[PDB]
Amino acid sequence: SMRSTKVIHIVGCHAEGEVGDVIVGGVAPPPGKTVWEQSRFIASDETLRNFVLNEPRGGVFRHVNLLVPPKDPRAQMGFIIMEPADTPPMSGSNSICVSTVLLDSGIIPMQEPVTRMVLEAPGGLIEVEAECRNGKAERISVRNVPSFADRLNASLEVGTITVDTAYGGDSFVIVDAASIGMELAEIGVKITKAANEQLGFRHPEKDWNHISFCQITEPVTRDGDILTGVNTVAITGTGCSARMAVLHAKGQMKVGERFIGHCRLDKTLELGGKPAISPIISGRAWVTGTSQLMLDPSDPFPSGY
Amino acid sequence: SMRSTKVIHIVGCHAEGEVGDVIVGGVAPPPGKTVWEQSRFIASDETLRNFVLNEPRGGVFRHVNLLVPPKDPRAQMGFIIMEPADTPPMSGSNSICVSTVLLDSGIIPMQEPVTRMVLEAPGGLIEVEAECRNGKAERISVRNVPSFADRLNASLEVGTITVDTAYGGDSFVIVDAASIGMELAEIGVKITKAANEQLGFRHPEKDWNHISFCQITEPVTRDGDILTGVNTVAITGTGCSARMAVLHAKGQMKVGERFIGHCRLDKTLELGGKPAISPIISGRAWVTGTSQLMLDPSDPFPSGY
Numbered sequence: 230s231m232r233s234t235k236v237i238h239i240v241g242c243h244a245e246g247e248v249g250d251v252i253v254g255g256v257a258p259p260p261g262k263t264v265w266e267q268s269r270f271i272a273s274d275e276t277l278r279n280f281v282l283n284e285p286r287g288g289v290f291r292h293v294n295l296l297v298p299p300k301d302p303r304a305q306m307g308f309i310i311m312e313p314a315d316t317p318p319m320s321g322s323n324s325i326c327v328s329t330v331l332l333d334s335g336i337i338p339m340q341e342p343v344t345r346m347v348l349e350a351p352g353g354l355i356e357v358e359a360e361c362r363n364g365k366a367e368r369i370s371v372r373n374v375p376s377f378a379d380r381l382n383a384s385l386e387v388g389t390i391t392v393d394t395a396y397g398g399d400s401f402v403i404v405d406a407a408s409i410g411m412e413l414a415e416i417g418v419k420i421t422k423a424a425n426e427q428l429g430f431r432h433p434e435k436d437w438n439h440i441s442f443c444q445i446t447e448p449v450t451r452d453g454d455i456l457t458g459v460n461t462v463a464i465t466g467t468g469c470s471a472r473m474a475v476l477h478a479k480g481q482m483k484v485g486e487r488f489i490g491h492c493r494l495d496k497t498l499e500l501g502g503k504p505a506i507s508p509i510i511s512g513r514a515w516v517t518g519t520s521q522l523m524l525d526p527s528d529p530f531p532s533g534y
Numbered sequence: 535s536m537r538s539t540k541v542i543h544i545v546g547c548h549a550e551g552e553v554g555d556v557i558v559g560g561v562a563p564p565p566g567k568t569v570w571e572q573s574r575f576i577a578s579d580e581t582l583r584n585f586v587l588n589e590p591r592g593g594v595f596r597h598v599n600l601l602v603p604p605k606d607p608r609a610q611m612g613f614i615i616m617e618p619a620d621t622p623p624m625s626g627s628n629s630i631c632v633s634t635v636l637l638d639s640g641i642i643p644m645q646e647p648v649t650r651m652v653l654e655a656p657g658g659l660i661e662v663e664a665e666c667r668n669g670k671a672e673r674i675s676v677r678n679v680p681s682f683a684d685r686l687n688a689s690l691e692v693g694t695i696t697v698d699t700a701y702g703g704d705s706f707v708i709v710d711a712a713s714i715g716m717e718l719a720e721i722g723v724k725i726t727k728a729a730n731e732q733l734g735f736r737h738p739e740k741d742w743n744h745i746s747f748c749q750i751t752e753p754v755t756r757d758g759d760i761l762t763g764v765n766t767v768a769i770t771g772t773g774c775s776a777r778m779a780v781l782h783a784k785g786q787m788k789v790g791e792r793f794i795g796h797c798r799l800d801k802t803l804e805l806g807g808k809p810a811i812s813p814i815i816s817g818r819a820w821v822t823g824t825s826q827l828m829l830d831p832s833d834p835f836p837s838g839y
Contacts, residue, residue, distance in 0.1 A: 230669030231638045231821050243590035246839055285548035285822050288593025333536045364535030515833040516536050517590050520825035528820040
């Protein structure tokens, strides 16, 4: 015989090779008056995160998204993103997976050639356009939350270097590799540490008040209205949104252009009192299965490992 | 809508913190006249392995076991072990998971306080005794396949060092750390490489003719009839079985004693023409859920990544 203290129902999914599994049942919505507050519970409490992210049920590269009811009536569904490192306001790949699961598994009805949805992420509403064909949500385009550069060309003591800070659904300190090197993971974290110490970060209308990661980049190359940039992140759709905000701020990217790390700088906005951009992130996703997660009452690793 | 080219039904499971998920349906038994030949198909063909082991469905630490019909009539069930690195003749933790899934999910009936089963692994029959209480297979004890040392104190050029080689369901070159160091993963693989080059390995009655891994150890400590030994493996129940075979060969472990890396040296045997031991490996396991794995026909990563 088996025993389980809970049963969590998941539709597995990945977007362009990034896992973004989706909890569709078995989890009541977290306490909180807003989707933001609900995500803060999930981040603080950690029970759901550890259970679905850690071995023996998850893995270091797993991301999991929890569907919850929309709090903003303009939205059809809310979701909370659980990544390995944090529980962020938004995530490109995960919003693509959530959209794909909602449409491919029939939770939201599908129109062809295009289905439009409004979803509510912790960081605000996102507009989704899905290209749908023969029953499949083939490609999802998401208008990400307002994204922006916080500091440009800020000096930071680590050598002594220059960095940008930016937000595109999560927060980054962004550094050119050559200005230091071309190991990276190790340097990346000290830089993030230092940036939090000396620059900080505060989102104008959301309570995200730290820098999560460091993005290390090499110079973009331009081909017409497409920019291509090599980068890595020391501990990506929020990465690209944040980087696009910096490139735009420094004049190296204009409205209407695309960035490939697809991302598109759709328009400018004002946020706080300062310039921001509206990024559109797009990608394809595929359902990878269904699962029912369980926990034996005698399992000595209730939070996994 | 969703599409899938296949549906594979799994009962998830871990033994003492090692994942050993079990395929219970959706996969026909592989071609082959023996469970050994079927495992060789699985190793060569790789389709099933890549599909269940790789992201986005698996992860680097996942092991998966495929139930198949017994070919030897003395067995109640056969199984093929799929680890990240290889498809081995036997595995302690995986045989414990297979036993636990068979009993806890009701495939084989449970008697209390003890259920006995005979299973067929690729490397031969294993005898299983499960301590069962209130419906739960609490602890499994497995008589592993005959295990043995192949070479003792063999010289190997790498510095110039001394090693033992041994088999306990998989094959190991075993080296004392201090005799080199106390990085390890990197040295481990060259040592394995060198051992394959200069010593080789050939199992007397099975077609396992190479050394899979290097085990790096520190000296055992003894407390009564319990030996405790620190070790690591550069790329564990087969590890402990192999190590016990060497300790026994060198006189540092006697019949009836236990080794904690639980393992027990139950008795001696002859294999080929040379001494071997019969290890009993024991541990607890817990079911972690059920899943139905799927593959969209348009997913460009049919073998995962």
